[PDB]
Design a protein around this ligand. Structure first.
Ligand code: CA
Ligand code: ZN
Ligand code: ZN
Length: 59
DNA sequence: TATTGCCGCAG
DNA sequence: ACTGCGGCAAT
């Protein structure tokens, strides 16, 4: 139940370093991976990949 | 100590 | 529909 990782600007706590890494980068606006179709930026390639289905033609 | 893929939760 | 989020496992 321990959440020993925390943000130095707002104090939000995390179970492990990954949640903190992502949270810090979200404060920074660090979104280095982009959708090749529309240019929208995301934190990582997994998030880009999940976004791609926006560009399918809807049923 | 670090980063992301996968995954589920929630709005 | 779309995506912000974050725990876990792996690296
Ligand atoms: Ca969760
Ligand atoms: Zn914070
Ligand atoms: Zn796109």
């Amino acid at each position: 139940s321990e959440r020993p990782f925390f943000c130095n600007f707002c104090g939000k706590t995390y179970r492990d370093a990954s949640g903190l890494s992502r949270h810090r980068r979200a404060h920074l606006g660090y979104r280095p991976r982009s959708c090749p179709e529309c240019g929208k930026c995301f934190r990582d390639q997994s998030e880009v990949n999940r976004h791609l289905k926006v560009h399918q033609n809807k049923p």
